[PDB]
Design a protein around this ligand. Sequence first.
Ligand SMILES: O=[N+]([O-])c1ccc(O[C@@H]2O[C@H](CO)[C@@H](O)[C@H](O)[C@@H]2F)c([N+](=O)[O-])c1
Ligand SMILES: [Br-]
Ligand SMILES: [Br-]
Ligand SMILES: [Br-]
Ligand SMILES: [Br-]
Ligand SMILES: [Br-]
Ligand SMILES: [Br-]
Ligand SMILES: [Cl-]
Ligand SMILES: [Cl-]
Ligand SMILES: [Cl-]
Length: 837
Amino acid sequence: NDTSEVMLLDTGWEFSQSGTEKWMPATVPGTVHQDLISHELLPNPFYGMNEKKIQWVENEDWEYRTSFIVSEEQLNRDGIQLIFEGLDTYADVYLNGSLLLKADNMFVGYTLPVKSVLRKGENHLYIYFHSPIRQTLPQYASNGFNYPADNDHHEKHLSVFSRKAPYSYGWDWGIRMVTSGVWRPVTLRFYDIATISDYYVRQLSLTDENARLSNELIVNQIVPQKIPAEVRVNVSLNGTTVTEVKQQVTLQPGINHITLPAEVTNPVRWMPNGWGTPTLYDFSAQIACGDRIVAEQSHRIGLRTIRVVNEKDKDGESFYFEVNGIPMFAKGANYIPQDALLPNVTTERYQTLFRDMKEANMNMVRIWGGGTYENNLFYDLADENGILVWQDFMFACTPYPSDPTFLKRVEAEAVYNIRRLRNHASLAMWCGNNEILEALKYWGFEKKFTPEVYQGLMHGYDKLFRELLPSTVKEFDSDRFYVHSSPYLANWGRPESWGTGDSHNWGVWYGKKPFESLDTDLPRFMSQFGFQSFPEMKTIAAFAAPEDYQIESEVMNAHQKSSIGNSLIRTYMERDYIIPESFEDFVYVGLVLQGQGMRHGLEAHRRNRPYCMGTLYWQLNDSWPVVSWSSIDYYGNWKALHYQAKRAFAPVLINPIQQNDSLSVYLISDRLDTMEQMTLEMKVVDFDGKTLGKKIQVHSLEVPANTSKCVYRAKLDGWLTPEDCRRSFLKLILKDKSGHQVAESVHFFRKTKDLQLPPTSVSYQMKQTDGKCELTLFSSMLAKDIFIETPLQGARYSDNFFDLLPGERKKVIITSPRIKKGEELPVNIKHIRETYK
Ligand SMILES: O=[N+]([O-])c1ccc(O[C@@H]2O[C@H](CO)[C@@H](O)[C@H](O)[C@@H]2F)c([N+](=O)[O-])c1
Ligand SMILES: [Br-]
Ligand SMILES: [Br-]
Ligand SMILES: [Br-]
Ligand SMILES: [Br-]
Ligand SMILES: [Br-]
Ligand SMILES: [Br-]
Ligand SMILES: [Cl-]
Ligand SMILES: [Cl-]
Ligand SMILES: [Cl-]
């Protein structure tokens, strides 16, 4: 690495409610809430009705302090920097009597020269965190109107004034925990001569024959002299040097601008998940002065082109991603913060989340603008998992101020996070905000303000999202796409805009439209659509006592932030299922419903390629125990929707789709290679296992790369009787020439509430060892949408929420480090027919 010494200021911290003079131990990085929780000074914020009880914290100011030693030799180093990667939010930072910083942007990292304020021996760091409420009450009082941020759960919508995670003020799947604190690491660096303040590896061009890079460095020298040095870039792959370049320089005190070209011939491209390996080079830049490496910095670098094509075309305006020259149908989801308390999210939780996306066959995630610019670990994981990232700037669902001061603050976050993130292979585009132009045009805001205020809001929209933010992107990340908003034009209520750019089709849910509307109401790229579900009972039990197990109990409503959500789920459930009586049965069928309905959408979007070029459902994940649109609950349990997403995103999908009493079958592929001389084979099977008719075979089919194509159509009438349809399913398999199976599907001709489901019994044998449970499942009769339920949080299943077919044995593997030999894991197996008598 280099001759610098880094000291982690991560222990010895204490905190205090300002005004009390009482100091208690603190954890940094961390938050006021966690620190309080860890001394039992707050109840569990996620439990029961506790949300109301923790609100008092946002009205107090909080102080934090620590002390640390600096030695004589440490004090003699040339430079000493103090780095705050995150302060949330209005924080005055004091060191040995000196005010170093009045911080006012959660999303900005601060690097402070501190050599002249440091002392031999003991040093004292104090940080005063003004309440971001108290701090903004006068600002709001001067404003003369309330911004219409309904997700800000307070009479006064103060979120919009602070550069601070929007969701912390509340959201419609969120708890309001307006927290403060040192939310990312604090480090102190003791170094010689200079630091590298920025290292940008800029791809000038990429062909199969050659990668042309420009290594741009900003080096800040802290000593007065003219310093001869040698700048060195080593490019290596898997530990072996690929190319090495050098440059003699003489460094001047202060800032220096150095550029070295580097070329990799016959580069190995980074490819996204499902297209091959996410290959990552190592680039290390070094500043050498004689024998010492005084500063080194490295990046992992993926060589690839990404181009968002947004052009007028026959169908409206396209919106798709072209990766290393090939149009890539995008498959993934909208990501929210994983916790009400950000520093509580662990390295392992990040790691598991990327595993969840990778195993569901996703190749994209959108970091939605109500959360944060994610940490370095998140983008590193997207890099090495081949997951493309759409990064919103942090504006959502409301217009925002656009005064000169507010814009300067935004500019500093825009530049800070662009430079932090621009070397990530995963980083695919920037989006100015979520839904704000939609809000301004369609959400009935004009009726809420005077014409003068509203016009000032429209002009204010332009200065931020059409001027400041695109300008910053153009300046600091000139090869990446920027768009002002998502969706940029299309509105789900306006059929004529559907062919223009991306869509948030909230016609399902908000517009109450049936899932089948997804087959007809098509976008050029679905950047959001979603449906709510209650999480499973083990997650319900984490916030509710069994006495509260009612849809409309007070504790249950405390965990449903959509006021129409419960009835809407019931309205949709009646359309496809028999609504059961017990709460447990409802929750289970609520899971099946969300998974089945959303998957039909994902299918439609893939099937309808190239007119549609992507689908990102709302939402991946949860920040706490709550009813939401997620596919994975707060504890990391996959909902049915996550398994269904995996299936619907499989690189090769057989997609039977039934409309107007007729069945077509499409074969859908995101493989880069064409498959030839394939056979689709299908057979109707009743609920006892008995074939009806013989095998239908379709031979000599080609499945071309990156396409969706009809290969079969047949009417239902004369093909099968109305009664058959209620008592049988269609099995589909796709095999190569030799007869090797590459894909499988099952089709039902009727809605589940109309199937004549047999009362049946699912038996299983279990072999349990340390960390693993291996079940073999049996039912002589079809068992519909089965849910293998265990009480163990975060338990992972090879599969779940699948139909168990008559007489067909099924092996399911469950893993968890909590599983121990000689300790029967409890299993409860539910299926549709059991939910009614
Ligand atoms: O028509 N609407 O009132 C509507 C539609 C969508 C919407 O937000 C999207 O949907 C999700 C579910 O409502 C939100 O949680 C998230 O903000 C996302 F951007 C929001 N919203 O969060 O204000 C409102
Ligand atoms: Br210094
Ligand atoms: Br500095
Ligand atoms: Br971090
Ligand atoms: Br007004
Ligand atoms: Br723009
Ligand atoms: Br039909
Ligand atoms: Cl509240
Ligand atoms: Cl986020
Ligand atoms: Cl819109």
